[PDB]
Design a protein around this ligand. Structure first.
Ligand SMILES: Cc1cnc(-c2ccc(-c3ccco3)cc2)n1Cc1ccccc1OCCCCCC(=O)O
Ligand SMILES: Cc1cnc(-c2ccc(-c3ccco3)cc2)n1Cc1ccccc1OCCCCCC(=O)O
Lengths: 243, 253
């Protein structure tokens, strides 16, 4: 409860764009095509260009999630090396869980909420830049059906970072014990914050396995791009993660 | 990295302090200043007042067996708090323990040994090596090479904190037969061995060559245990009325 307050507080300190802020906008400049895209920017091609904007957004979200993890209690007392592994395998599951907050069925907020880019447009991109995008929308649309708010998400995101099964963890039991607290606070929080909704906690535990699968298939698609899109550059911060 | 290695060592040392009833520090204070057992008479006096059948050589062998079963139990609890030991496959745990306990047991046995004998029954007995030599073959023979190993090992003057990491390196051995995730085991061992190199510079700053010296003792320990296991084979073969504890049967199987 206090613990949940504190993670919420940390979430607010660290993420410029909260679901709260995002929902109030979604109910910005549309970008539904080439002309609109080009106007918004007022190079290789439109697709690789959109991909570079994805990369720019992911990079920044890694930075935020990195500062955020510093506030999850005991995270800072893990081996430095365990910290890095937790961040490495988890940031993308967190990044895709938080994507739901800025997405609706028709598209997503960009540039701090000033823009909206239609899901139509992103589908129009040539393969495989279309295929790496659309599966996130399918996930985000369902996730949003759970109607979580920011306070819930702050715990959700922390539970994802503190996952016991990452490859190469030295102290699994310690990481697991921190997560178990996070998961307990989260159950407690959902009872209190969503008391008439029913079965939310284990629906959320399932979403965590849905994301793990989503990031598997994303990593899968990224390495295909790493080869087949010979001329497409990848931010070095994103090279370590995919290494 | 440097700060993680320190903390990893400290974790291994705490696991050690919590799991072994007898540390070298305690053993050394007892040895330097128990009831001395040096003959049949003092032996029987001990089974009557140091409480903790067939013939003397076999009775001694049984007590050797009771103590090693107990140390195997402590080593299993110890390994449970070696960081990453408990999230290995359950079959890798059992395998690491089955092939490594004896190496760990004869490493640590140096802690409770001097050239004249060793502590028994948590430091309340001392059995002289002369008495153990006087036992009949093959029992006297399975004993004396551990003393020879222990005397030279003690000359390296390790302490508990060094030993905790040395023992962990013996348990987390990548080379044991029939492991499922060899690369994972090898990764933990390498981390243990880096932590060890670092801890020795810090704990033994004037000792030249101490780390490669310990890698060699690890080689010598493997040969000692091979030789030990051949002898246990010969005893199973030739001493038919002598029994072996079922925990030890599983290991030797
Ligand atoms: C998570 C996110 C947040 N914001 C954006 C975003 C930003 C600006 C644009 C835009 C389009 C036209 C101009 O700008 C599109 C998406 N994304 C990206 C994204 C949203 C939905 C589905 C999939 C996505 O990325 C998949 C590729 C990520 C590659 C790098 C990596 O693996 O790390
Ligand atoms: C490791 C240890 C620790 N303490 C003792 C100990 C205990 C009590 C007596 C005692 C003699 C009279 C009354 O009690 C002697 C030795 N040992 C045993 C031992 C110490 C030195 C050399 C060899 C040894 O074992 C040889 C047989 C091991 C068989 C079991 C197996 O393979 O697993």
């Amino acid at each position: 409860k206090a613990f949940s307050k504190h993670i919420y507080n940390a979430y607010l300190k660290n993420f410029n764009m909260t679901k709260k802020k995002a929902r109030s906008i979604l109910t910005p400049f549309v970008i539904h095509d080439i002309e609109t895209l080009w106007q918004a920017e007022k190079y290789k091609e439109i697709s690789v260009h959109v991909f570079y904007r994805c990369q720019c957004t992911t990079v920044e979200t890694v930075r935020e999630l990195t500062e955020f993890a510093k506030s999850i209690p005991s995270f800072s007392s893990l081996f430095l090396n365990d910290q890095v592994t937790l961040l490495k395998y988890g940031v993308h599951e967190a990044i895709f869980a938080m994507l739901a907050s800025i997405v609706n069925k028709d598209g997503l907020l960009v540039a701090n909420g000033s823009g909206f880019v239609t899901r139509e447009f992103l589908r129009s991109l040539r393969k495989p830049f279309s295929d790496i995008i659309e599966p996130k929308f399918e996930f985000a649309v369902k996730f949003n059906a759970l109607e979580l708010d920011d306070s819930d998400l702050a715990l959700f995101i922390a539970a994802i970072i503190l996952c016991g099964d990452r490859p190469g963890l030295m102290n699994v039991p310690r990481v697991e014990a921190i997560q178990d607290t996070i998961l307990r606070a989260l159950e407690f929080h959902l009872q209190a914050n969503h008391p008439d909704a029913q079965y939310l906690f284990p629906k959320l535990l399932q979403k965590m396995a849905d994301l793990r699968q989503l990031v598997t298939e994303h990593a899968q698609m990224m390495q295909r791009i790493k080869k087949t899109e010979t001329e497409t550059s990848l931010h070095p911060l994103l090279q370590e993660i995919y290494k």
